[PDB]
Design an enzyme around this catalytic site. Structure first.
Site, PDB file in Angstrom:
ATOM      1  CE1 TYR D  70     -23.426-122.918   0.320  1.00 21.79           C
ATOM      2  CE2 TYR D  70     -21.319-124.002  -0.082  1.00 21.79           C
ATOM      3  CZ  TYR D  70     -22.423-123.784   0.723  1.00 21.79           C
ATOM      4  OH  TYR D  70     -22.515-124.412   1.943  1.00 21.79           O
ATOM      5  CG  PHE D 130     -28.865-108.630  24.587  1.00 21.74           C
ATOM      6  CD1 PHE D 130     -27.625-108.002  24.566  1.00 21.74           C
ATOM      7  CD2 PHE D 130     -30.001-107.885  24.274  1.00 21.74           C
ATOM      8  CE1 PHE D 130     -27.517-106.651  24.238  1.00 21.74           C
ATOM      9  CE2 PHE D 130     -29.903-106.533  23.946  1.00 21.74           C
ATOM     10  CZ  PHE D 130     -28.657-105.917  23.928  1.00 21.74           C
ATOM     11  CG  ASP D 131     -34.490-110.889  27.410  1.00 26.02           C
ATOM     12  OD1 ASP D 131     -35.625-110.389  27.268  1.00 26.02           O
ATOM     13  OD2 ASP D 131     -33.785-110.702  28.426  1.00 26.02           O
ATOM     14  CG  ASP D 221     -24.270-109.574  22.799  1.00 24.15           C
ATOM     15  OD1 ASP D 221     -24.647-108.678  22.017  1.00 24.15           O
ATOM     16  OD2 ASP D 221     -24.992-110.532  23.129  1.00 24.15           O
ATOM     17  CB  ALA D 223     -26.154-105.518  19.165  1.00 25.29           C
ATOM     18  CE  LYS D 264     -31.064-103.978  18.651  1.00 21.50           C
ATOM     19  NZ  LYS D 264     -32.446-103.534  18.999  1.00 21.50           N
ATOM     20  CG  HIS D 457     -46.805-109.989  23.199  1.00 18.67           C
ATOM     21  ND1 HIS D 457     -46.655-111.324  23.508  1.00 18.67           N
ATOM     22  CD2 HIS D 457     -45.686-109.632  22.525  1.00 18.67           C
ATOM     23  CE1 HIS D 457     -45.495-111.756  23.043  1.00 18.67           C
ATOM     24  NE2 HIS D 457     -44.887-110.747  22.443  1.00 18.67           N
TER      25      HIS D 457
END
Ligand SMILES: [Cl-]
Ligand SMILES: [Cl-]
Ligand SMILES: [Mg+2]
Ligand SMILES: [Mg+2]
Ligand SMILES: [Mg+2]
Ligand SMILES: [Mg+2]
Lengths: 465, 465, 465, 465
Positions: D70, D130-131, D221, D223, D264, D457
């Site tokens: 842990y 990013f969204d 950010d 990725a 990514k 969708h």
């Protein structure tokens, strides 16, 4: 009696044997706080059994058969198929603790829209809520009530199913609160009360009868579904000749859905499940699956890798192995019995953990000086064992006064990672306590040298008094 | 004293717990022959420790980093680098038992061409030749002689290094035979005499001095190089504070090359090594590497997969872990001591195995009725343990007379797969023998119902008398 | 037309892109011998397709489900079950090239004892013996004869099954030699003649009819059983709508046993099989299984690790995947067609390999100066491709005269590891040859700087002339 | 030019080749919605590149070396060490999208307490959010502004670094809003604007200069940190001869912390990171690590399994491989160029994805009839390709009016899982579009048969008009 392992060890993680001098220096470097010790410096790590256990060959192999497709994954299908065949539940949502943060708000809104549930009066019931379960309930503005039986926390009074629901209490509680105001009932198996106690199938059926009468959703908190099934097979006469699988299929007829961390009985280091039995809860399934994506207030994606779902699909079965369960449970009981024999007293001890009373073991140390933390350090010094304090140290200070919070007892928790340690390690732990009890009078109390404002137990540093 | 495991179990292979009735039917189906039992029906399989042990995390992980190139493989390079850093040997030939079938004819021809070795007079020496080593020597027309010490097979007479070479005997043997006629000397560590006994570094240095004086090639049969190093650290005062690695580097200065099955101390299920120390044996390296390809009388290719070489490259190191060796050896000694305590007698017992005297345990059963095979069956019936008979059953009939061959003793061999079973299993085995010894008088002898012409022990079927 | 991969790449082994200068220095360090190049310095390694291909997810995962028991292993059972369901053969012997060294002497002795076979007159037949198969036959004192069809080696004359047995020739050969003197017939599929050519089921049935008439054992050399099945599905009208599995089951009715290296179509880096169809060959099974243990003249043990048998058990099935076979074969044909288009000429090209005529490509280089080895070096310099010379360099010198042996043609072999390289790599290879053909006149011949007495191609070093 | 793979394929996931009739039935069963198709029925899945790519041998092997402790886990240490050596950041928090839900509220509160930030006026800046990043910002009551350059979304106007910050705009925005009210600036690399566009190091340095001047925290950010480094090496002259590793170390001097999804460029199927450069942000580290535990309003535990941290520790390095990056990027560009050549038009196309304009490709289909969804279905019918619609179908209805929301364009997104498909697959995709464009006029529009209230969708079913 410690049973022999119903398995052959196949892969091992080497752990070095340290000297007393090395550990003495180590514990000082970590500020008398095992949480700050390097894992490599811990011989026997009893910190937690959550995701720290071994896996079977088939489970490990499964990690290499993953289908990483975002949707329609055969690995997701395999996991859902396991759930269907094991629990009889048709709908599965893999999680990465069973998504309590999801089903709770979903069930609350369901009853509010369908039966006029009053959010200012709502109350949820359980034979015993897990901390996080109670946490999410309350955060959602829902009050919780644990309706456990009188014998639950009564040590020195053997009872086969101390985790049972107090059927009368549940009935009375629902009537008191008003059925429209009870969003759900959570059946925790095994129960987290008194160190971990089983729930009988008779009790579950009775509870489900009550819930069904009032049309109240029942969620089975299933982290330890297999050990509960084993206790039923061992103690509930009616199911003596039933297989763990049959007992599990039967048990789950008495809940409408299930939520579970797979990091316990399911034998995996990560993952969980949120499942629904049949079409009657299809809308609950849809809502949860939907909220899973937009829980943050907008779409967010991610999930278990394919291999992890394949591994859990296998783990759910291996976790029910009869020989394995008998062995796991016997080992835990072996440790407790061994400690009791040498004079070590536990406030509570069950299938989940053993809570040693450090206050009684080290009576000369004031509570404010953390006798359980002192005991944790001594156990490390003497045997390289790491255990967690459940006392004044963990409790912390009152956020409104900055003063130490009052604590009922100074306990030291002992958990056992599954299929990780042997009877020899158990004897090593017992011998360690025997040594501590013998040198008790000389163990010193602790005082801070560094203390964070919050969650101090994780990184605080102390010194001896 | 059984030491606690210096490791955390990470992967397990489930083994089912059978009922007495199930095993009774199983042993009958297998014709009272454990060799014919399904592995799944064996709870504790003590058949062999060859490639049946556990691997470490790093070793298993290595299997996924293989370079399968036929030549110039980085995986081959990694394995050769391990050999160079561990043994100090510059030349490595991976094998898939250390290619004895290769170095033997190569060394014989070398001395025949360089010193006029006479094939009709050649004799090879060893502190104790392994069966296959003696086999290849003799097949090549070379006579073998084991020059072990007087204390070697003398039980009831503790000696730290019973595997030692009889230095005087070796000297006298070489002179007797003629140095030009001694193609090589094999130093087996640990020695296979008396159940497995260590060889001291002092003894190895002395032996190498003798070999060097006569310019005789010395091959270190290294299946258990690590356990020997551990015994040296434990019993040879001079090396008390030396690490296993330092002891190994020093030990190998006293051989010119090494041959070893990696299926023992090296912790792998397959593979071996044939290595040469330096340029002085470069021609021997070339010849062996060449013969490896055309051993059949024409080119034949193949070899360990890349992952297997990467795994062994790691295994050679993990196999030398001090805590691991102390634990492995202590467990073996724990079993022997436990058996001795309950009255079970072994003709010989060492690091490799324990040879229980079934004749003494079951005196009412005639040798021709295979008391050790009867004991093997009883051990399976009672505890699901599988062990191999080393007696009249294995010995077989005289190929020229078809009559049972005379056998010195009826023994039952107990081997212990590395890092596979626990102290609880050891106690289970001891309790099993305790039960057998108690019900000895009632165990029946065996007689054939089906018997192959050769290697009958593997598939023969018998019934009780 | 290069087909798109019927799979998703899941695990990759990084390979560095080198500069021309780097490779120029590399090839010089390796003495103008690709065999001495480090694997990491080779961009596209076309050395061999034996055990150098990729595995499927399920195959890799299987390696972690091994039962290492010496006998009765469930992993052995799984492999035997695969053989039974795929080939219909009831008896399986796992090998670590199909144990030719075993069945050959066994079949010879069988016919000698049963039909009075004369060892001085014995002759074995095959549509085309593999080198090692012919090697073991001859070593056992058995003469071999390849009864291939006229169209077999005739390029510029398309024939669907160039690997077919010359049925008339076989019949005439048996009569000539005497049926009592023909120990066995080996049906190689696909055949190794002319770069790899398929054998029709009609041809196999006809051959088996002949063999059965004379009661001659038929062994199916099955390294490429799947590709042969694919060619039958593609070219033999009768089996157009049959699955690869059905074609394989049918194909194996026309042999009595099978021997195969699993390092080709079976997709594994190690292992093989020696199997027998039914009870009529049970004694042959027993004898082989027996000889397997005492092949050295005494007992020797060992075998594939459990995981390896589990992997092959899966590989046998994945190797028959229809989309995979169509893709593998199409890629090979794509390379050959691409080379033919740019003017590169091959003496022979089939499913196994393409043999480029370096003599024709580099006419200015004398055979004794190894034009194919020169071409191999140039291909490496220009594109980092490694290929093996099959010419005067490999042929070597006459052991009795020390003079260069005369060679029919100077060829450079191109093999393609399965599921390892892409269409882009194939185009890269074609572009490389296009460049070489363009700069042909400037490529220099080679001469030794270092030459071993035997197997010189593996470690000889040369320089440019 | 599609570059050849700088690697050997080692493990493959078989994918079946379906018939046109099979897919026609499949798409109907899925209600003309690829999201409902089984993964096994998809030949080329271009749904997402998030965690769907291949891993290297070393990365996969790492999964078997996990330390599940842990706290104090050596696997956590290994991951932190990788971050320190690669980015130069001393503090690491593993996440299971970089814990945006954590650092955002932490940074907001930091500036509110230290500089009197006004929550009603706060605004965060980024070259392009990013969204999810924008989502968490706004949920926390923080307004966001994308300060991208004019050339960013301008197609037909080549610019080396379209992801660059509009330095003037940033400066003007900060002054306008008030520095005390800007909680942080997020530098997204590569930028998600226009299909994925790189950010220059010169631009990053300039942006950091501005941020430092105003003492505003800068979060990278990351990725796609590796692909950005590759574009810098390829297009920013100053760094032409710098290694990807050197460019990465330099790049990260211009941020105070980093947040990234490891799904990514880092090559893993799960995990992320939230890291802090040095002591100046130690308090931010502590706060985040603390909030990580109590983010729900109470303690909740869990994290990546040991093997996953070991895998990412390796992945961070393998993801920076120069040959790999050049190959990955070239393949993406190869697909786009191929599509452009056949007349297919994209609204935007970059390193992240290509957005095909289905409206232009299928002009006869009304927007309300989802031409991009129709195109997705046709692409599946014709080639078994699965792609996601980014148009009216995805946009959905106005929650307040229940009417279809107006959409700017009907796009079909194409993403490419890393190291998964080959040039042959790319050509297959191009040929598929060529066929669609040719049969465009005959493709029908769609209409609902089943429509969920939210996130339609994912599970909506439609039929042709
Ligand atoms: Cl598997
Ligand atoms: Cl590794
Ligand atoms: Mg995923
Ligand atoms: Mg190989
Ligand atoms: Mg084995
Ligand atoms: Mg964990």
């Amino acid at each position: 009696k410690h049973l022999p392992e119903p398995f052959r060890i196949r892969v091992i993680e080497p752990v070095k044997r340290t000297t007393r001098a090395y550990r003495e220096e180590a514990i000082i470097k970590s500020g008398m706080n095992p949480f700050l010790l390097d894992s490599e410096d811990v011989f026997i790590d009893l910190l937690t059994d959550s995701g720290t256990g071994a896996v079977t060959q088939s489970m490990q192999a499964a990690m290499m058969r993953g289908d990483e497709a975002y949707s329609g994954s055969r690995s997701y299908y395999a996991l859902a198929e396991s759930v269907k065949n094991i629990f009889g539940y048709q709908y599965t949502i893999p999680t990465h603790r069973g998504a309590e943060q999801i089903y709770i708000p979903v069930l609350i809104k369901k009853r509010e829209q369908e039966k006029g549930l009053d959010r200012s009066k709502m109350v949820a019931f359980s034979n015993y809520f897990f901390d996080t379960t109670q946490g999410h309930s309350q955060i959602n503005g829902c009050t919780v009530r644990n309706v456990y039986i009188k014998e639950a926390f009564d040590t020195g009074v053997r009872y086969d199913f101390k985790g049972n629901f107090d059927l009368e209490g549940l009935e009375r509680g629902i009537e008191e609160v008003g059925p429209n105001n009870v969003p759900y009932i959570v059946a925790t198996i095994t129960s987290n009360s008194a160190g971990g106690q089983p729930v009988s199938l008779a009790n579950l059926k009775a509870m489900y009868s009550i819930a069904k009468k009032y049309d109240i959703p029942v969620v089975m908190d299933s982290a330890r579904f297999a050990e509960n099934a084993y206790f039923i097979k061992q103690r509930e006469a009616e199911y003596k000749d039933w297989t763990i699988e049959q007992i599990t299929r039967e048990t789950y007829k008495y809940a409408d859905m299930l939520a579970m961390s797979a990091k316990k009985d399911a034998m995996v280091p990560m993952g969980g499940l949120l499942c629904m039995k049949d079409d009657s809860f299809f809308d609950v399934y849809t809502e949860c699956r939907t909220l899973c994506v937009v829980q943050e207030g907008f779409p967010t994606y991610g999930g278990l890798e394919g291999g992890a779902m394949e591994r859990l699909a296998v783990g759910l079965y291996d976790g029910m192995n009869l020989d394995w369960l008998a062995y796991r449970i016997a080992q835990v009981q072996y440790l407790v019995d061994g400690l009791e024999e040498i004079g070590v007293v536990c406030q509570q001890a069950g299938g989940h953990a053993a809570f040693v009373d450090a206050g009684k073991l080290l009576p000369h140390i004031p509570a404010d000086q953390f006798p359980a933390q002192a005991l944790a350090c001594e156990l490390y010094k003497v045997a390289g064992i790491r255990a967690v304090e459940i006392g004044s140290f963990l409790l912390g200070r009152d956020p409104k006064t900055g003063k130490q919070l009052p604590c009922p007892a100074e306990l030291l928790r002992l958990t056992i990672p599954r299929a990780t340690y042997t009877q020899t390690h158990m004897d090593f732990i017992i011998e360690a306590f025997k040594h501590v009890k013998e040198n008790a009078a000389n163990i010193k109390g602790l005082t801070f040298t560094y203390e964070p404002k919050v969650l101090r137990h994780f990184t605080a540093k102390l010194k001896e008094v």
